[PDB]
Structures are given as structure tokens and as C-alpha cells.
Design an enzyme around this catalytic site. Sequence first.
Site, PDB file in Angstrom:
ATOM      1  N   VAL A  27       0.820  -1.213   0.000  1.00  0.00           N
ATOM      2  CA  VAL A  27       0.000   0.000   0.000  1.00  0.00           C
ATOM      3  C   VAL A  27       0.857   1.267   0.000  1.00  0.00           C
ATOM      4  CG1 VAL A  27      -2.207  -0.871   0.900  1.00  0.00           C
ATOM      5  CG2 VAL A  27      -0.351  -0.299   2.500  1.00  0.00           C
ATOM      6  N   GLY A  28       2.109   1.133   0.431  1.00  0.00           N
ATOM      7  CA  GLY A  28       3.030   2.265   0.496  1.00  0.00           C
ATOM      8  C   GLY A  28       4.447   1.877   0.869  1.00  0.00           C
ATOM      9  N   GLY A  29      10.214   2.654   6.048  1.00  0.00           N
ATOM     10  CA  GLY A  29       9.952   1.238   5.647  1.00  0.00           C
ATOM     11  C   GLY A  29       8.749   1.055   4.735  1.00  0.00           C
ATOM     12  N   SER A  30       8.645  -0.135   4.147  1.00  0.00           N
ATOM     13  CA  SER A  30       7.535  -0.496   3.263  1.00  0.00           C
ATOM     14  C   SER A  30       6.331  -0.973   4.072  1.00  0.00           C
ATOM     15  CB  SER A  30       7.963  -1.610   2.306  1.00  0.00           C
ATOM     16  OG  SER A  30       9.291  -1.421   1.850  1.00  0.00           O
ATOM     17  N   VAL A  31       5.133  -0.632   3.602  1.00  0.00           N
ATOM     18  CA  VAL A  31       3.889  -1.017   4.272  1.00  0.00           C
ATOM     19  C   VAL A  31       3.028  -1.932   3.393  1.00  0.00           C
ATOM     20  CG1 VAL A  31       1.796  -0.185   5.454  1.00  0.00           C
ATOM     21  CG2 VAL A  31       3.921   1.121   5.633  1.00  0.00           C
ATOM     22  N   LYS A  46       4.313  -2.971   8.647  1.00  0.00           N
ATOM     23  CA  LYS A  46       5.432  -2.129   8.241  1.00  0.00           C
ATOM     24  C   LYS A  46       6.756  -2.835   8.516  1.00  0.00           C
ATOM     25  CE  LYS A  46       7.087   2.630   9.026  1.00  0.00           C
ATOM     26  NZ  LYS A  46       6.841   3.801   9.918  1.00  0.00           N
ATOM     27  N   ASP A 161       2.284   8.519  12.676  1.00  0.00           N
ATOM     28  CA  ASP A 161       3.614   9.160  12.549  1.00  0.00           C
ATOM     29  C   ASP A 161       4.045  10.169  13.629  1.00  0.00           C
ATOM     30  OD1 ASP A 161       3.283   9.214   8.926  1.00  0.00           O
ATOM     31  OD2 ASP A 161       4.140   7.660  10.221  1.00  0.00           O
TER      32      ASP A 161
HETATM   33  F1  LIG Z   1       2.704  -0.644  13.502  1.00  0.00           F
HETATM   34  C1  LIG Z   1       2.533   0.146  12.425  1.00  0.00           C
HETATM   35  C2  LIG Z   1       2.526   1.537  12.557  1.00  0.00           C
HETATM   36  C3  LIG Z   1       2.346   2.345  11.430  1.00  0.00           C
HETATM   37  C4  LIG Z   1       2.181   1.763  10.172  1.00  0.00           C
HETATM   38  O1  LIG Z   1       2.000   2.559   9.059  1.00  0.00           O
HETATM   39  C5  LIG Z   1       0.760   2.661   8.478  1.00  0.00           C
HETATM   40  N1  LIG Z   1       0.612   3.307   7.282  1.00  0.00           N
HETATM   41  C6  LIG Z   1      -0.585   3.425   6.670  1.00  0.00           C
HETATM   42  C7  LIG Z   1      -1.697   2.866   7.298  1.00  0.00           C
HETATM   43  C8  LIG Z   1      -3.059   2.762   7.042  1.00  0.00           C
HETATM   44  N2  LIG Z   1      -3.738   3.233   5.965  1.00  0.00           N
HETATM   45  C9  LIG Z   1      -3.223   4.226   5.044  1.00  0.00           C
HETATM   46  C10 LIG Z   1      -4.018   5.522   5.179  1.00  0.00           C
HETATM   47  C11 LIG Z   1      -3.605   6.517   4.093  1.00  0.00           C
HETATM   48  O2  LIG Z   1      -3.759   5.927   2.798  1.00  0.00           O
HETATM   49  C12 LIG Z   1      -2.951   4.761   2.595  1.00  0.00           C
HETATM   50  C13 LIG Z   1      -3.321   3.687   3.619  1.00  0.00           C
HETATM   51  N3  LIG Z   1      -3.715   2.096   8.010  1.00  0.00           N
HETATM   52  N4  LIG Z   1      -2.747   1.735   8.970  1.00  0.00           N
HETATM   53  C14 LIG Z   1      -1.535   2.174   8.588  1.00  0.00           C
HETATM   54  N5  LIG Z   1      -0.295   2.104   9.123  1.00  0.00           N
HETATM   55  C15 LIG Z   1       2.185   0.376  10.049  1.00  0.00           C
HETATM   56  F2  LIG Z   1       2.022  -0.199   8.848  1.00  0.00           F
HETATM   57  C16 LIG Z   1       2.363  -0.434  11.170  1.00  0.00           C
END
Ligand SMILES: Fc1ccc(Oc2ncc3c(NC4CCOCC4)n[nH]c3n2)c(F)c1
Length: 341
Positions: A27-28, A29-31, A46, A161
Site C-alpha cells: 500500500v506504500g 519502511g515499506s507497508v 510495516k 507518525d
Molecule cells: F505498527 C505500524 C505503525 C504504522 C504503520 O503505518 C501505516 N501506514 C498506513 C496505514 C493505514 N492506511 C493508510 C491511510 C492513508 O492511505 C494509505 C493507507 N492504516 N494503517 C496504517 N499504518 C504500520 F504499517 C504499522
Amino acid sequence: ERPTFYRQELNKTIWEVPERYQNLSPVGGSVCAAFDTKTGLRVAVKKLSRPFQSIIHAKRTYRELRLLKHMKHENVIGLLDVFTPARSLEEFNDVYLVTHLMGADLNNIVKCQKLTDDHVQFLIYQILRGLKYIHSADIIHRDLKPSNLAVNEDCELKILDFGTDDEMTGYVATRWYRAPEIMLNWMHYNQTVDIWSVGCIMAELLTGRTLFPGTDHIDQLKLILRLVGTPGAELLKKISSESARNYIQSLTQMPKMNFANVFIGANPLAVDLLEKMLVLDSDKRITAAQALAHAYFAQYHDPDDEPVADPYDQSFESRDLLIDEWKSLTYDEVISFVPPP
Ligand SMILES: Fc1ccc(Oc2ncc3c(NC4CCOCC4)n[nH]c3n2)c(F)c1
């Protein structure tokens, strides 16, 4: 016991995760988005990139894990899980963080359009509720903007963040929500920087337009001072940066504008709150706790349902340690993690 891990290449990177996590999609470190078969939750995973490559990076990895492990609030991103495929400290080189998958961010919600006053009330209420909690632990977000405010279908909100010069340059949303004292490094700043950001966000939800869309640092400051007025003698003294103070005094003085003429048709209570948030002198800005009790949030406010955080020990921040020392501390935190009920 240790779960079974399986391997998969996704973002030209090999992800090794417990079996419980299925259907991993970038969807998007790498996520990655995933389905947690154990909880039935849609999750975001992440994987940190090179978490221990330097002292600065190793400390940052520790910092992010400490912050995420501490946050336990409806309106703040928290840790559902943290894991490593490593069986020992000597093998330890990757960290994976798991939280709730949110459907969109606030940018997707606003989409160049005005929101109803009720929607604004509910969204800003949740941001402030989350901020009261974050601030109560002596944590500052520092970079609040629509893109780190994630929202579900029911408009339920979580803050992401919390806690380079090129990306802050020019006509960029990375700088539009920043308090003037930090944009121009006027002074030792505090939690009140986040309240400025909320003011900017709230205004944008109400009008559908960026409040201070500056083309650069100087243009943005001019946009700010036109609305809120040039600083008085009192604030000038607090600008400990002699250079910044000197520049500020070179500007033609301007009075504070009438916010009711700026935000035509807006709820007078919203206008009032904006005036209390968008104060140049950070000492005098409304706090998150004070803002929650403002009449604008009458239909949402509940003093018994606006919790504060447990004490957060951040003595590590002033500590100088080696890479392997930050790494060992991080490992201890991964191993000791307890999932939420
Ligand atoms: F433990 C974590 C903390 C932050 C993290 O980053 C992250 N990034 C993004 C998201 C998300 N959704 C996004 C909202 C914005 O549009 C893209 C998806 N829902 N939860 C999310 N968490 C992650 F993946 C794990």
C-alpha cells in the site's frame, strides 16, 4: 512459542511473516495491507528498512518501537503486534510492526471540497482527543497534517507518525501545517506546535482550501502574519534566534484580521476556536485539553471519556549508545511485547 514464518517477495524485498498474516498487498519502511486470521482484523504491516545501519538509524528504530508500544488510545495508531524472524539477538536484523488498516487519509476526505460542520466537529474532536493523550505523555507529534490522519468508513480517526530541507522547500504540503516558530526555528518549541497544525487542518476542512499555501518559507510567513498580525514586543523577546528576530522586525507591521470575515458562513463557535488555536505566541495557544471543553464540541465532549497516557520514560533520548547497544534494547522490546486484549 515461536510461530511458523513463511517467505514472500513483494516490494523487491523478502517479507518473512507469521502464518496468521495472509493476503499481503503493498500500500506504500515499506507497508503492506494484510488479513490477520487470528483476530479477523485488516492490518497494516510495516517492515523497517535497514533498521540498524547507523547509530542514528538504530536509535530511530528503538524510538519508533518505544512510541508505538506506549500508545494505547482509540484515536492514536497503536501496536497490534511486533515480530522478527530472528531466533536470537545475533540473528536479529529485521523488525516488523503491525497496526490497524485504515481505509483513507484526511486528504481523500476533503478532496477540494467543504465538509459539513458536523463532520468537522467529529473529525477535529477525535484529533484533539488523541492529542490530549499524546501530549499527556510529554510526546509532541511535530508533523501533523491531513496525510497522517487516517480515517475509516464511519469517519473514525487515528493519528499516524507521531514523535529533509529539500522536501520542505517550495509549494509543498509538507510545510503548510507547520507552526511559524518551527518552520523558521525561532525558539525551543513545545506541544503547542501541534495545536497550530490542528488550526490549519480545521480551517481546510471548513473551507476546502489550504489555509497557508505558501510557495516558500518566506511567502508562507507573510500569509500567516497577514491573518494573525505581526508579532508584538512580548513575542519578539521570546524569539531566542537573534537572526530570526532581526528579520521579523524588518517587516511592515500588520494588525490581526477579523476571522469572521475570513471564514464567511462558518459556525461562530468554529471561528472562535480557530482564533484560540491560531495564535502566533505559542505560550498563549489553547491546549488540547482546553480545546475539548470548548463549546464547539458540546455534542461530543465527555470529560470521563477523554483518557490520558501512562508515564512515558524517554530518558533514552539524551543517551549516547553504540549501534549494538540500541539494537539490544530494541530486541528486548520486541521479545517483551504483549498483545492487546
Ligand atoms: F505498527 C505500524 C505503525 C504504522 C504503520 O503505518 C501505516 N501506514 C498506513 C496505514 C493505514 N492506511 C493508510 C491511510 C492513508 O492511505 C494509505 C493507507 N492504516 N494503517 C496504517 N499504518 C504500520 F504499517 C504499522
